[PDB]
Symmetry: C2
Subunit: 68 residues, 2 copies
Amino acid sequence: SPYSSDTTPCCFAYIARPLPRAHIKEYFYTSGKCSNPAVVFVTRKNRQVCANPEKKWVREYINSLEMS
Amino acid sequence: SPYSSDTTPCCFAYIARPLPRAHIKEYFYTSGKCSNPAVVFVTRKNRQVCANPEKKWVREYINSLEMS
């Protein structure tokens, strides 16, 4: 992008415990304007969380999110 | 902080036009886990925007936000 005036979702920490996919409205990755590329889950309570794609349940949710 | 698993509001761009303080629920600064320290306004539509403190209306809103 050329220019965007909006806060960027940069995640640096990672959660060890998994989250309730049921309460996980949607998620998304983040990088470029950050220190490292990581994932970000979002529940219905506008709650954002940082998760690494090197986990066993993390990639399980992303794959269970974008199905056919 | 020791460790926090949450996306950080890092702003790098800046808006030239001012915003409607009336629709500006609240704002906050951002830095540390970012490239540069900047301000961030938030309207009732959970809309976040990046604003520099070197403007004429920006510091006007922050000062008009935290009054006595």
